[PDB]
């Protein structure tokens with residue numbers, strides 16, 4: 029069950045991922061420690077998100093099994109389709125990054141794997 033407004037608790041490889049993809053140290057030092065809200069509304073295939081990237085609210089919707097355009101940090105807007113296992117594990121192919129989102133009861137983890145860099149968020153359902 030994915031529906032909820034999930035507040036951020038722990039954020040792992042933020043400094044190593046944002047410098048590896050080409051972002052500024054001034055904006056990285058602002059968004060690294062802010063405990064913001066990460067929303068998801070589960071409508072069968074269409075998952076409507078409202079995500080806090082430090083100060084910016086990035087709101088887009090992903091379709092499980094058909095093409096869906098989402099905003100990236102380095103780039104523009106990526107058509108990344110998401111596959112679902114057991115109503116808790118969401119897997120996609122972003123801008124050369126394997127993104128794995130897992131729901132453990134009422135706590136969600138977003139693990140963005142870029143080769144050796146493992147960018148892991150840990151947010152609780154509210």
Ligand SMILES: CCCCCCCC/C=C\CCCCCCCC(=O)O
Nearest residue numbers: 055056058059079081082083084138
């Ligand atoms: C889907 C969950 C993962 C979301 C990851 C978002 C990563 C954002 C990374 C870097 C951008 C940080 C921007 C910080 C605010 C800058 C503007 C300001 O307040 O001055």
Ligand SMILES: CCCCCCCC/C=C\CCCCCCCC(=O)O
Nearest residue numbers: 066098099100101129138149150151
């Ligand atoms: C590089 C980050 C750009 C911002 C959008 C990233 C979207 C990734 C795609 C699909 C997974 C969406 C997961 C939504 C829940 C995030 C929970 C969290 O913030 O802790």
